[PDB]
Structures are given as C-alpha cells and as structure tokens.
C-alpha cells in the first residue's frame, strides 16, 4: 500500500479537505428560499463566494505551500480557482449525497439566468467525471494537484511548486493502482481530465459576460477571481 510518509500526507490533506463545508445560512437559502432567476443567481454567487474562501484555507494548509514565494502564491490561487470549483462541482453531482438536495441545486442552477447552451455541457462533463468512480480521497488530491500546478502563467519558481505536486501525484497514482488494478491506465485517464478542466477555464470567462440578472453584481471576491 502507501508508505508512512504518503499516509501522513494523505491523512493531513483529507482533514483540511473536510475541515470546512457550507455554512448553514447558505444551506438554508438552498432549501427554503425563493425560486426566481434573480435570487438563485444570488444563492449561487453566495455559494461560489464561500467556496473560494474555503479554497484559500485548504490551500494555505497544503504542506509547504507557505514556503513558496508570496507572488507565486497568488498566481496558483488565481490560476486554479475556477478549475477547483468545476472539480468540486463534478464530485457534488455524483455524491452519495442523499435525497434531492443536489436535484435541488441542479434545478436552481437551471433557473438562474444561464443559458442551457452553457449549462448542458458542464453537467454532461460532470457525468463523465463520475463514470471514473473517484473517492473523496481521490477528489481531495486531484484538487491539490490542480492548485499546485507549476505550469501556470507567472510562476517565477516552477521548480518549487513541482517539488510539492510530485508527492500528491505519487500518492494519487498509487491509490489508482490500489483502488483499480482492473485496468492499469486509470491514473493517466485521471490526469487527462485535469487537462480537460483547463479547457473550460476560458469558457467560464465567456459565460460570465452573459451571466447578469436584474442588473445585479457579483460579489467583490468573485470579481477578483473570475476577473469581472
């Protein structure tokens, strides 16, 4: 199985992963609140907004992340943020998540003033992520791997970032082998989708120009991270 240094590291990442979850006050508006395009756009930008904060906290706690250059630090978080929201989306809409709570989120997302033209493929992709039957351990690592990407624009010390992603990859790869000896190209088919994640990055930029309701406004931190 995994080694003692790849198990401390595992254990740790999972903790920080599960550390924060959605605050009730948001989870209340998902169940018990107005079902207009407006308002849904409100719940979904509250949600998005919680999610970066929770991200920025998980990232901070990545082993050796705060060693890195503070300029690099921003560039990874700006770089990975949309990608982590997509990936957590994926996991969300497959999850053993119980009765109708995600059915509910799927239904709000579709009455929040986004076109079915953008909305249809992002679930269609979430479907295929799902087919690959990943564990929360797997989601947690890939999420780390995508944040600690050293190939991102404006990284000034690419070597420092890869000395951190490497373990995370080792660990994920091994656990792909442990989990799934059936077919042995499963690790590579994981990574391959991480590349696909990067494609949607610019699609996300685009659709944001069309995603306005009531003449409302995204929240400030959303304007920084998705640059709107």
């Amino acid at each position: 199985e995994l080694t003692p240094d790849q198990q401390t590291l595992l254990h740790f990442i999972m903790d920080s992963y599960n550390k924060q979850r959605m605050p009730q006050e948001i989870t209340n508006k998902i169940l018990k609140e107005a079902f207009s395009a407006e308002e849904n756009f409100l719940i979904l930008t509250e949600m998005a907004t919680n999610h970066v904060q929770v991200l920025v906290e998980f990232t901070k706690k990545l082993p050796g992340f705060q060693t890195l250059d503070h300029e690099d630090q921003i560039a990874l978080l700006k770089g990975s943020a949309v990608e982590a929201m997509f990936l957590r989306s994926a996991e969300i809409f497959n999850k053993k998540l119980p009765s109708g709570h995600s059915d509910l989120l799927e239904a709000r997302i579709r009455n929040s003033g986004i076109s079915d033209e953008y909305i249809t493929p992002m679930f269609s992709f979430y479907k295929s992520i799902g087919e690959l039957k990943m564990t929360q351990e797997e989601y947690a690592l890939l999420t780390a791997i995508v944040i600690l990407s050293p190939d991102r624009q404006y990284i000034k010390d690419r070597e420092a970032v890869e000395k951190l992603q490497e373990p995370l990859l080792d660990v994920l790869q091994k656990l792909c082998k442990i989990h799934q000896p059936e077919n042995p190209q499963h690790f590579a088919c994981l990574l391959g989708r991480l590349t696909e994640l990067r494609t949607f990055n610019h699609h996300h930029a685009e659709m944001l120009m069309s995603w306005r309701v009531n003449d409302h406004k995204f929240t400030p931190l959303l304007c920084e991270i998705w640059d709107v």
Partner: peptide
C-alpha cells in the same frame, strides 16, 4: 453571520 463571510458577501 460568519464575520468574514458577510462583507465578502456584501456586494
């Protein structure tokens, strides 16, 4: 009302 989450949510 989560000290940081409000303000962050305050558009």
């Amino acid at each position: 009302e989560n000290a940081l989450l409000r303000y962050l949510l305050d558009k």
